[PDB]
Structure formats: structure tokens, C-alpha cells
Design a protein around this nucleic acid. Sequence first.
DNA 1: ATTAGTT
DNA 2: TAACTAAT
DNA 3: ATTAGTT
DNA 4: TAACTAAT
Lengths: 255, 255
Amino acid sequence: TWLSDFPQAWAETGGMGLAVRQAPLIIPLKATSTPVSIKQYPMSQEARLGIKPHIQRLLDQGILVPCQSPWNTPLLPVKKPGTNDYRPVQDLREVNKRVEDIHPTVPNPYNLLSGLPPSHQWYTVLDLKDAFFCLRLHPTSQPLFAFEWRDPEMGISGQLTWTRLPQGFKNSPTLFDEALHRDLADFRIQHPDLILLQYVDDLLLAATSELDCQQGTRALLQTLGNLGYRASAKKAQICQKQVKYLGYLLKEGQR
Amino acid sequence: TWLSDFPQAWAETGGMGLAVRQAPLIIPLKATSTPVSIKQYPMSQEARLGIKPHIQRLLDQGILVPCQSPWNTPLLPVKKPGTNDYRPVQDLREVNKRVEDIHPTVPNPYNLLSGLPPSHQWYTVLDLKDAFFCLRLHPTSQPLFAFEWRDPEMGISGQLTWTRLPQGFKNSPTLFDEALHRDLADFRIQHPDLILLQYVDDLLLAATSELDCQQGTRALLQTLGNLGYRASAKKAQICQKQVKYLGYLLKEGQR
DNA sequence: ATTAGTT
DNA sequence: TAACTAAT
DNA sequence: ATTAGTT
DNA sequence: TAACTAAT
Ligand SMILES: [Co+3]
Ligand SMILES: [Co+3]
């Protein structure tokens, strides 16, 4: 009854996340970075219609808001099947170029697994849904990610931007990790007898007894939901001795 | 009166050389080297006629002799002007490939000049004419350099080879150096007060006083001629304080 | 007449 | 992955 | 619609 | 010096 007891912990029934303990993130520019406004590319009506639903709900979620910036980058309609079913994808490459770098705190997977004792044979693997959107963007920096939203077949607005850390931003991964490591510190302390592996949106908890593993998973789920994060209950793995994580298959401590 | 007193020392009036103190050189093959016979390329009558004079005189000098080998490499007619005036040039590249390597004893020019004191401001520069031909080839190894000599416009012989170290052989330079260093050892000993720079065919003697420099040049010339070497009196430099050597201009010790 | 070798 | 230069 | 980047 | 693949 996991999905049951932790309603606010799952994306499926907890609703959009929002890391409240985190202060709006400010994105430092390079000393010589000056705004770049690239005009939106033409888009077949089918494509424009394909991404409309998303945009809409994002606006409704206050994740996208109307604005006016000297910045502006194109929006690209991508698909997976033959070519149907589109997804909005913004090309932030020029913004990334003008943004200030930061030290990659994220530990590569291999060494990340190094810190894993055989003593803990029980696993739980969670992955957060829309990890980035849980982190607020400081108003000052929000202008950097604006893009133009039109609709020749429906008058429609103009330029919109993000209010949360966006997809395609070269530092979202690193910025998110740091954030989560900060927010899961208290947990690590309150459960010295557990091993929490953290790699951005991908989490791994390991314990000695399947009993602990479960008690651990609850404290964790309770905490995640509490702090404002949501994990995909769908693709989740709870209390096992064989679990697939970061592309490695964990079996008794193999891979 | 230099050309005068050392007749046997100059190519111009000493005649072909022959290092007698040297034992016929044997060229060691690689463990897996098996003979290669490449058929001669067609040659315009003009070209064949252009190189005839040389060949002839080489045969007359006993430097080229008739033979019959399983080896055989093409002969190429090369020129310098627009394209007239040809010179026989043999392509020994395949033979070099099948010949055993040896340690490059020749010191590169730069470090070669390193061993040169400022105290010696007087220079003499000689260069040997047909350096390689002064070294005899052991009968056993002579077969390696055979090539086919025809003449559709004059019945003519067939296959001929060298009796002396040939041009285009990847080890002639090194083999020659060693030889000359061996033959000029006694001189170095008998004239501790001189500096002899040796780089294959290119020699440089240096002394303190222009007087020594001259006395030195004589002992040297007498020795060269004696041993069987000939220097091009033509392009020679005797007793100077500024002499061009190995591509460096020596002035008071510059370059 | 071929070739080792180099943006 | 598209010739060219020296050099034998 | 562009692009970093790789025999 | 002759395209192509992922990826935003
Ligand atoms: Co070049
Ligand atoms: Co590739």
C-alpha cells in the first residue's frame, strides 16, 4: 500500500512538485555575456497544435508566465514515433554559451557505486518526475529562458518564460543535485544505518534487512513528498535484492 | 698552390677514389628478406641515350660490372633543367626495405657544431667527390643492387650491378661516416691541436693560427689522397675565418 | 614509375 | 575521406 | 532549424 | 578536405 500512504510523494497523485526549502536560483552570466534574441522558426500548424496542450498546462501550473525579454530562443517540436506526437523542446544552446560555469559536483556513476557496502542487500530505487521544475528561478534570471509563443490560427499572446529551472539548461543537472543533497542531509543523519545513493533525479536506498529497507523507504517517501519532490510511482522499485540502477544491475552486489 | 701539391687529393686531378683500408662491406639482410626483382620500366630513346655516357664510364671504372641476380630494381632517368640532361637514378626503395638496419652513428649538425671552441678561428672546408664509390662492396652483397641495362637501339648486355657502395642506399651515409672516422683517427691523434668536424662527405678543420690551419690542411689533404679519398677542389674553402659549413655561416664563431 | 607521408 | 610533394 | 564534433 | 549523428 505504498502509493496509498504517501499521496504527496508520488507524481501520479501528489501533483506538481516545488522544492520550498530552496531559494530562487540566480544564474550568473559571464562577464561578457550580452543578450541574444533569436527569432522563432516557422512551424507547421500540426506541430504548433501538437505542443499546445503542454504549454497550456504549464501556464496553468504557473511554470510558464507571460513576459518581455531581450532574450529569446527558438522552440522546436520533437517527436518519437514515426513523427507524430510532438513535444516542445527549446534550443537553449546560445544561452548556455553566455552563462557562467560551475564546478560539476555530481559524482560519475562508477565511483558513486564505489561507496556501496555488500552488507546492504536490500534495495529501493526512485526517480523524481520533472525534477527540475521543483526548483524556482529567481525573477532576475527568469528572462534568460524566454521564448516566443504564437498561434497564427488563434491570435494568441507572444513571449513567455519559465518560473522554474528548465530542461536543456547546461547546469540544471548540477544545480538540482546540490539542491537535493542539501535537502536530504537531515534524512542521512536520522538514518545512519542506511545508504542513500544520489545521482540527480535517480535515487537509491540500501539497507541490511528488508524490514529496515521498508521503514527506510517510508521515511524517505514521507520526506520527499514533504520537501516538495515527486517520484514516478510508475517506474519505481521497492525493497528488492535485485534492482536496475543507473544502468547497472544490482544483484547481491554485482555490477 | 694547393691543387698543385696534392694531385691525388683532388677529384679534379686525382682520379676516382677507393678507400683501400676498408674491407668490402657486407650488407646484412633481415631474417625474412627474400629477393625482389622488379622489371625495368620503359624508357624513351632520348632518356636511354641521356644516361648512356655515365653507365659507360662507370663500367670502364669497374664500378659497374656485368652480372646475374634474382634481385633487380628499376633505373629512372632524372633531370634538373626544363627536363633535358638526364642522370641515372636507381630506385632502391624495395632493397632498403629488405635490408637490416644499423645504429645511426652520424651526429646531427647542431650537436656536431657544439664541439667547436672559439679559440679556433681559422677554417677549411672540404667535401669529398663521389664519397660512396670509395667504399668497396663485398661480392656476396653486390647482387642486391643489380639493375637491368638494355638498349633496343644497340643490342646491348642485360643485368649489371655495383662493386662499390651505391647512391640511394639507406645506409651508405652511415656506413661511410664510420669508415671515414676510422680512417681519420690517426690524423686526429697526430694533430691534437686541430679540430676536425666530420659529417659524412662534409669535413671541417679548424685551427688557432692561419699558419697551423694551412699546415693542417696539407697533412689532411695528403692523408685523404693517401687513404683513397678525393675532395672537390672546385667547391672548396681553404683557411678562412668565415666559411659556410653544413648550412651554417661560420664567422668568428657565429651560427 | 612509384611512393612515403601530410590538412 | 580529397591530392600532392619530394624522393628514390 | 541548427550544431558540436568525429575517419 | 568529404557528411552525419545526436542533441538542444
Ligand atoms: Co607538406
Ligand atoms: Co561517431
